[PDB]
């Protein structure tokens, strides 16, 4: 059985979040949690919250027994960007992008 | 086309293509190159042919 949890419009660039996603691709949830607990990165908190939400969904809605779950799939997409202005020298102006991302996690007992 | 006939920017110095009007027919919201007018389409036939 597949259970999915998502976090859309997360305030972070996709490239920075992708460094943490591959740390746990294919592991068991029990070791994925404490792997995520001891990395000093901002995106680790977001990915950990998504993973815990997925585990709770997989426990409540469908069957129980989270002792044999695995991270079957995980990937990060790109959300819409917000555009701003930053002044520069001699009267010029520059465009700033604030990128977002979508985070998806799939777990399965099988 | 509604608008003013002022040159958008100077001829030389800026790294942009030369422009001379905002109503040019190749700008967005510009005019039509060969715009149409109300027209008459009737032809002539001889009486004997009719």
């Amino acid at each position: 059985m597949e259970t999915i949890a998502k976090h859309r419009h997360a305030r972070s660039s996709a490239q920075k979040v992708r460094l943490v996603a591959d740390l746990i691709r294919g592991k068991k949830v029990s070791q994925a949690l404490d792997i995520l607990t001891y990395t000093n990165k901002k995106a680790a908190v977001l990915v950990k919250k998504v993973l815990e939400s997925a585990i709770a969904n997989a426990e409540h809605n469908d069957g129980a027994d989270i002792d044999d779950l695995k991270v079957t799939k995980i990937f990060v997409d790109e959300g819409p960007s917000m555009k701003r202005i930053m002044p520069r020298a001699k009267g010029r102006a520059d465009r700033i992008l604030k990128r977002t991302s979508h985070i998806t996690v799939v777990v399965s007992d099988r | 086309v509604t608008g003013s006939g002022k040159k958008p920017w100077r001829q030389k110095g800026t790294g942009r293509a030369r422009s001379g009007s905002i109503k040019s027919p190749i700008w967005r919201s510009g005019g039509v190159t060969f715009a149409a007018r109300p027209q008459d389409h009737s032809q002539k036939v001889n009486k004997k042919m009719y």
């Binding site: 701003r84 202005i85 | 100077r10 110095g13 800026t14």
Partner: peptide
């Protein structure tokens, strides 16, 4: 809650000059 809005501005195209000597002057 409020929705996000964008704005923009263009420069006057200041007439900069090449203050060093000419490339192949007289």
């Amino acid at each position: 809650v409020a929705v996000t809005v964008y704005e923009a501005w263009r420069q006057l195209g200041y007439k900069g000059s090449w203050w060093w000597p000419r490339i192949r002057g007289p």
